[PDB]
């Protein structure tokens, strides 16, 4: 389990987008259609989507950039 | 007197003993004071305290859960918990906590679908209660309506 | 629920009874009992949760690790009055609670009462995850100073483990550092000794 | 300790470091003993002359 | 350990801690002394 | 009885009058776990009565607060009891004293934490000699109440059953007494009464093949709420003049 | 802050010869209506402080301010007035049951309140 | 090694029927006293035993009313019945039956001796009668277990079974109950000082010490001997 | 609060609203699985008939062939086998949900199958003549099928009057009938 | 049931250095966790054989106020870094080292004289601090065979560490088997000054302890 929140919060800074993307982000995962780009450790969509938020790949620019990508790849 | 006493059971005046451990099986130091104490147990047991409860019976007026173990019933929050729930900025708690859980009828039942279906996905509604407050007021002489 | 005291349990950490879970979650034992091919009807699934069977534990034991859940006393009154913990299954009738956040819950554990909730969607979990969480709620939001503060049996021992009658056994021993714990539990000295030499890096 | 732990490190060593804290007092405070009982208060003789 | 963010209610954050120490009490020229130079 | 007193315990027990007391007593003649018998001796002893005093126990009957009362005696056989003197010890009384709760063996020390505010540990020992174990009665209750339709009857006959539900019931429908319960077990077998219909060729094919139920009556039979468990004491049965069911009365 | 709020007005500034306006209110009228167009018609103001048990009375919208102390007379009139309350503050939030503007969702009601811009 | 100098079960001491007193051969320093708690621990954790599992009997029905002629309450002869101590054979889950009429007391001397039940303490009291037309009849089960069982654990057990009429008690099969050790030095010349571990145990008389201190000693090497590989 | 307020029941027909909730189905389905539901009696047989809820349901595509995949479907949604519309299909459904070992299972089958009449007028010699089943030896397979529990819905539903509102009182006292 | 016992299968061990090592165990049965690990940590630390050193004889004044000649490091820490030395014989008993180096400065164990069953885990640990000039010293150490430990206030002159361990602790937590929860987990972390396997010195005292019951039992379960 995840111990604290500081990582991503640092990446972020508002300390509110954050809870929004990865809001955004764990919701894609769980409907299913995506793929972790993070090794999983048989952890939930939640954490799993917070340590890749925190390891530096995943924001609310990068998401929105693959959401327009694959919205025009229709 | 009582340390007079003691002499006669032949038990240490001062009233401590030494004590080993149970676990390391070593001396403790600054031996413990050990005794016999009367001790009673009280009425507040916790075979009748506890109460859990996920969705039971609710009530026709204000739809609302219905309370204090009375027929399996729900618990309360209060207005100094949304104090502090609204003072953290978790106001998608607060969302859940005012359509989800309360009598939004509409909701439960979506709610019940899409955690069953494992969606977790949030459909907000619009309370009953409020509805309930509107017809109250218009009872009077008053016109409430909602505009666009 | 009642509530104890988690001596271990470390601090992001609460004590949940399985009595009351099984319940709380039990819509979503459903559904990962229909995800498991386990339960082919909603009745059967009902059934099986209603007769305690070894894989209904199993299937709550895995659901609930990684979700929080949140508590909160009775008369809550400054910011911290409500929190969010990992919950830890415990075969019991009370909930048991961080040592420490007793101070901030203003809690006494005498007979004494919390609410639970369970925290349904994702975002929920998510703003549990990040701003409830005791992790993040060190500093006090009123003055400054640090909310989690030891008072009590911690600071006894503490201060026993910090002195010295004149010299205890072993006055002129020197060691490295790592000694100390080794020659305390066997034999040569204790932690009352003075004028005691290691080296510190 | 806990104040400085927090303001040089971060969060992850002085929270550990609390809980580490409060682990090894607990053991020492169930290895110390620490009783108390009548003789341990000790009333100075001289009230006597001083009522 | 930052400037205070956008978005958050300051007044619920504040009022909330000013009542909460309830542990108050209810019921109720010639002579000038320096402590220095 | 506890080992640290005050003296006014002998007195409060004898003065609530939980216990039964002893008046004009020479000597016990018969002592049963439920009754007392004293022969009072002639010198307390006035013309016109045989000379002998009974006194009928209280066994575990319930109390306001759904606690279980009940009295023990103290007099074996044959004992010479004079006037004023205690003979069965109520709740919480051991020989005349108030009593209410165990010595228990205490060490005042920090223990990993566990005692840490106000926590208290507690021995297996303690679980095992069954110190500080309560007994507790619960009352349930049920009424017929006479409808237009027809009256309520108790006859154990409920449609939509199993037998085995029914393998606690006896021929009335109350249970048998000193028997177990947990869930929501039926313990009273009331059937409600429905109201006649048509012809209804379904309903009428349908009493030709099973009947017996027609679906007269509906199933109001009483059952254990959820949550409790435990065995049946005894049941009473308070029946108006003027009827004369009694099957089991 | 809380207590520094209805500030009352002398002289008429072409606003309104009225006492009991907002002070915000009244700077922004002093804003945008000095420095636009006439920086003449001046507004003198008295800074008057309400107490705890008053200054939450006054307040733009009915819906609030009336669980507070009474609502039979903020009914009655918001009634003969007829005020609107667009839901402004955090209870009116609570009241209607939607995304309170504060904390993570304050960006999503900002959005709405950008998405009232055009349509 | 260098010569640890095995110690080995002598003088075995037997100062009453339920109190012994056990010593051993002189040891290495170091080892007294954890040999000791290791020993305590495990003599009073897990050392099988035979106690009482349910009670059946045709008088009374159930567990909180009376019969006419007894003194105490039948949860008093429950509870009596509780602590009687008995050992039996190798086969196990017996039955014994009890029957007495008359005004006498009621102990464990006048119950129906089999082959393979032996009563340590035939001075018990069973809830000696009162009237002279009382006359009780009933019948025990003893069985053997290790640890500490409640009733409410084995109702899984019985569910068809169990009539009305028979009555479930607690288990202890703990048949010791009280056990010390102290760590001294004597009874060697030759070589260096040495240290004698002398054990004070207090037991009910169904188990003999001699046994219950090789079952021990048994035990921990049955559960030790997975750390070797 | 504790003010008391109507507590909402199942009603015999919430139970399977919620059963269709849960249960996957079309949106077309769900719409003929409410409809089904409409069709619902406290007995628990459908009222209505198939060809009913086929003109209800006002659909060129609405063929008899979905509504009765439906309707099965229904049967076994909810615990208590409903909307069989017959004896027979109640019987057999509860033969169905009973475990194939059963004593004359077959038996009992063929007989509730197309022997309903037999048993309705109790012709235990037609029956026997006809089915050729065995002599006394069929009783058991009757006493199976008489618990088969008839109308299962019934179970669900649950009311009472409660009331007869008198308006006179006469009744014995001192050996007298005084009124 | 009657005698059977829930014996440790999960027996995985994760190691962070060759010297440290952390050690977890499946759940045991109720309260053996405790008395496993008490009884395994002071039989592990009171009583382990090895070889360590035990005196020296350096040139100059046998009391502690000695000075530096150019060692300018006191003997007492120079003492304190002998301590932390492991030397391993194979066969031999007592016996004495010496070393003998130039004024570069970095005194490493290379410098004693190379024995045939005396043996040096690490050779760059630090006997003697940065020597200021080209003057040399002599240590005449020696090491002996025991057990356990022994100070050197009464059993004479450094120090006497026959225990080749370094730090050792257990931890009990709850576990459950299928249903029930009190199960005893075991979990042993220890460190290691060197030469030995922390696998293999749990192995060496589970042995010792093993032999050290043996006669208890009497010959038993012999089939």
Known sequence: ?74 | ?148 | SVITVGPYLRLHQCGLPKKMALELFKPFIYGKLELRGLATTIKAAKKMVEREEAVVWDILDEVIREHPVLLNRAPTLHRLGIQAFEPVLIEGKAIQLHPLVCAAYNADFDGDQMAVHVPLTLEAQLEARALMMSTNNILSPANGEPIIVPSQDVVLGLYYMTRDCVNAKGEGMVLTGPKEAERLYRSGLASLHARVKVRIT | ?51 | ?37 | ?249 | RQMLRKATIVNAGSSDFLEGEQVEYSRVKIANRELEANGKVGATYSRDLLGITKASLATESFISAASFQETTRVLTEAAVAGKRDELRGLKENVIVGRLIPAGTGYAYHQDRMRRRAAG | ?229 | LPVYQGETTQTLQDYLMWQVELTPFTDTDRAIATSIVDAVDDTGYLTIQIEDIVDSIGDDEIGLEEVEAVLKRIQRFDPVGVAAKDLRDCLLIQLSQFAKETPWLEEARLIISDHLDLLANHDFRTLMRVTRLKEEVLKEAVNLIQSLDPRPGQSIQTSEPEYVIPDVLVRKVSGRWTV
């Open chain 5, 1 to 37: 350990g930052h400037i205070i963010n956008k978005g958050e209610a300051i007044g619920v954050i504040a009022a909330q801690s000013i009542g909460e120490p309830g542990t108050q009490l209810t019921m109720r020229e010639s002579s000038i002394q320096v402590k220095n130079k």
């Open chain 1, 1 to 74: 389990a995840r111990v604290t929140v500081q990582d991503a919060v640092e990446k972020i800074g508002n300390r509110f987008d954050l809870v929004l993307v990865a809001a955004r982000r764990a919701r894609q995962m769980q409907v299913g259609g995506k793929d972790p780009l993070v090794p999983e450790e048989n952890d939930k969509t939640t954490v799993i989507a917070l340590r890749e938020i925190e390891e530096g790949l995943i924001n609310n620019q990068i998401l929105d950039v693959r959401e327009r990508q694959e919205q025009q790849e229709q």
């Open chain 2, 1 to 148: 007197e009582i340390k007079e006493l003691l002499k006669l059971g032949d038990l240490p005046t001062s009233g401590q003993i030494r004590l080993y451990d149970g676990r390391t099986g070593e001396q403790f130091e600054r031996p413990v004071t050990v005794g016999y104490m009367y001790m009673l147990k009280l009425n507040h047991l916790v075979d009748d305290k506890m109460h859990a409860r996920s969705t039971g019976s609710y009530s026709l007026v204000t739809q609302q859960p219905l309370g204090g173990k009375a027929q399996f019933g729900g618990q309360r929050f209060g207005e100094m918990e949304v104090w502090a729930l609204e003072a953290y900025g978790a106001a998608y708690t607060l969302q859940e906590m005012l359509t989800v859980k309360s009598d939004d009828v509409n909701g439960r039942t979506k709610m019940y679908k899409n955690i069953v279906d494992g969606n977790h996905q949030m459909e907000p509604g619009m309370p009953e209660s409020f509805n309930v407050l509107l017809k109250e007021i218009r009872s009077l002489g008053i016109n409430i309506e909602l505009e666009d």
């Open chain 4, 1 to 51: 300790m806990l104040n400085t732990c927090y303001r040089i490190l971060g969060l992850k060593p002085t929270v550990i470091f609390a809980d580490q804290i409060m682990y090894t007092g607990f053991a020492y405070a169930a290895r110390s003993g620490a009783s108390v009982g009548i003789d341990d208060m000790v009333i100075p003789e001289k009230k006597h002359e001083i009522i």
């Open chain 6, 1 to 249: 009885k506890p080992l640290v007193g005050t003296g006014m315990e002998r007195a409060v027990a004898v003065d609530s009058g939980v216990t039964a007391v002893a008046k004009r007593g020479g000597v016990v003649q018969y002592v049963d776990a439920s009754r007392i018998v004293i022969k009072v001796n002639e010198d307390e002893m006035y013309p016109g009565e045989a000379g002998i005093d009974i006194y009928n126990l209280t066994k575990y009957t319930r109390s306001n607060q759904n606690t279980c009362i009940n009295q023990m005696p103290c007099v074996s056989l044959g004992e010479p009891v004079e006037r004023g003197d205690v003979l069965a010890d109520g709740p919480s009384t051991d020989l005349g004293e108030l009593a209410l709760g165990q010595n228990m063996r205490v060490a005042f020390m920090p223990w990993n934490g566990y005692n840490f505010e106000d926590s208290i540990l507690v021995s297996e020992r303690v679980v095992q000699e069954d110190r500080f174990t309560t007994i507790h009665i619960q009352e349930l209750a049920c009424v017929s109440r006479d409808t237009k339709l027809g009256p309520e009857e108790i006859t154990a006959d409920i449609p939509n059953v199993g037998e085995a539900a029914l393998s606690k019931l006896d021929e009335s429908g109350i249970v048998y007494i000193g028997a177990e319960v947990t869930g929501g077990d039926i313990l009273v077998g009331k059937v409600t009464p429905k109201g006649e219909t048509q012809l209804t060729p379904e309903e009428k094919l349908l009493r030709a093949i099973f009947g017996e139920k027609a679906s007269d009556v509906k199933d109001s039979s009483l059952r254990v709420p959820n949550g409790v468990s435990g065995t049946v004491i005894d049941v009473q049965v308070f029946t108006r003049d003027g009827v004369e069911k009694d099957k089991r009365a």
């Open chain 8, 1 to 229: 090694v260098t010569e640890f100098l095995k110690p080995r079960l002598v003088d075995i001491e037997q100062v009453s029927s339920t109190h012994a007193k056990v010593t051993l051969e002189p040891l290495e320093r170091g080892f007294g006293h954890t040999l000791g708690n290791a020993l305590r621990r495990i003599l009073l954790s897990s050392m099988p035993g035979c106690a009482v599992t349910e009670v059946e009997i045709d008088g009374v029905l159930h567990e909180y009313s009376t019969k006419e002629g007894v003194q105490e309450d039948i949860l008093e002869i429950l509870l009596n019945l509780k602590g009687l101590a008995v050992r039996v054979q190798g086969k196990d889950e017996v039955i014994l039956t009890l029957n007495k009429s008359g005004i006498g007391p009621v102990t464990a001397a006048d119950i129906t001796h089999d082959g393979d039940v032996e009563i340590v303490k035939p001075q018990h009291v069973i809830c000696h009668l009162t009237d002279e037309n009382a006359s009780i009849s009933m019948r025990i089960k003893v069985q053997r277990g290790r640890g500490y069982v409640p009733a409410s654990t084995r109702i899984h057990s019985e569910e068809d079974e169990r009539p009305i009429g028979r009555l479930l008690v607690d288990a202890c099969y703990s048949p010791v109950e009280r056990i010390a050790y102290n760590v001294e030095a004597a009874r060697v010349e030759q070589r260096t000082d040495l240290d004698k571990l002398v054990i004070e145990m207090e037991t009910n008389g169904t188990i003999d010490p001699e046994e219950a201190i090789r079952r021990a000693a048994t035990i921990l090497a049955e559960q030790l001997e997975a750390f070797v590989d």
